[PDB]
């Protein structure tokens, strides 16, 4: 597994309504699964576009440690929510977003409400799922490779599937495989 120190300093907690999950804090932007803006009665046929319009900035509670990061904008890029905040993360590492394939390994920093609890070497199965240990709250954990001193973020966990396997996106919000957040 890759050492996790660069990524630990980016992990945050995002809460919307009933829902709380992990966010990734880079520069003045927090990335997290967009389904954070759903109460899961919305989870049957969500209109994310109508949902995101209905939210205002104070609807989003972002905390890194016991600092609040004030959200000053919210946009959506495919399936990831992008919260603009009023401060840039002074611990932002050199980073890039990359898309990978099943079979290629990466490390995942499992967190429970912005709090890191393990780092694990994973790969997606050919059907783009991943079998590990991440329940409610570990939603939003990200995966990465470290190449020299640059963190290539390649994965964000979004959902546990009925089979127990997990589905996720890349950091541009595009799901790996045919999965949907519905």
Numbering used by the authors: 7 to 188
Any passages from the paper?
Domains I and II (residues 1 to 184) have an antiparallel β-barrel structure that forms chymotrypsin folds, and the substrate binding site is located in the gap between these two domains. Additionally, domain III (residues 201 to 303) is a compact α-helical domain connected to domain II by a long hinge loop (LH-loop, residues from Gln189 to Asp197). The protease is known to be activated by dimerization of two monomers, each containing a catalyst dyad defined by Cys145 and His41 residues (active site).
The crystal structure of the catalytic domain of SARS-CoV-2 CLpro was determined at 2.27 Å resolution. There were four protomers in the asymmetric unit. Interestingly, they existed as a dimer with dimensions of ~83 × 48 × 36 Å despite the absence of the dimerization domain (domain III) known to be crucial in dimerization. In the crystal structure of the catalytic domain, dimeric interfaces were made by backbone hydrogen pairs of Ala7 N and O atoms with O (3.39 Å) and N (2.88 Å) atoms of Val125’ (the other subunit), respectively. Therefore, the N-terminal loop contributed to the formation of a domain-swapped dimer by interacting with β10 of the other subunit. The five residues not well defined were due to the absence of domain III influencing a local conformation around Ser139. The crystal structure indicates that the decreased proteolytic activity of the catalytic domain was due to the incomplete construction of the substrate binding part built by the LH-loop. Enzyme kinetic studies with a FRET method revealed that the catalytic domain alone presents enzymatic activity, despite it being approximately 8.6 times less than that in the full domain.
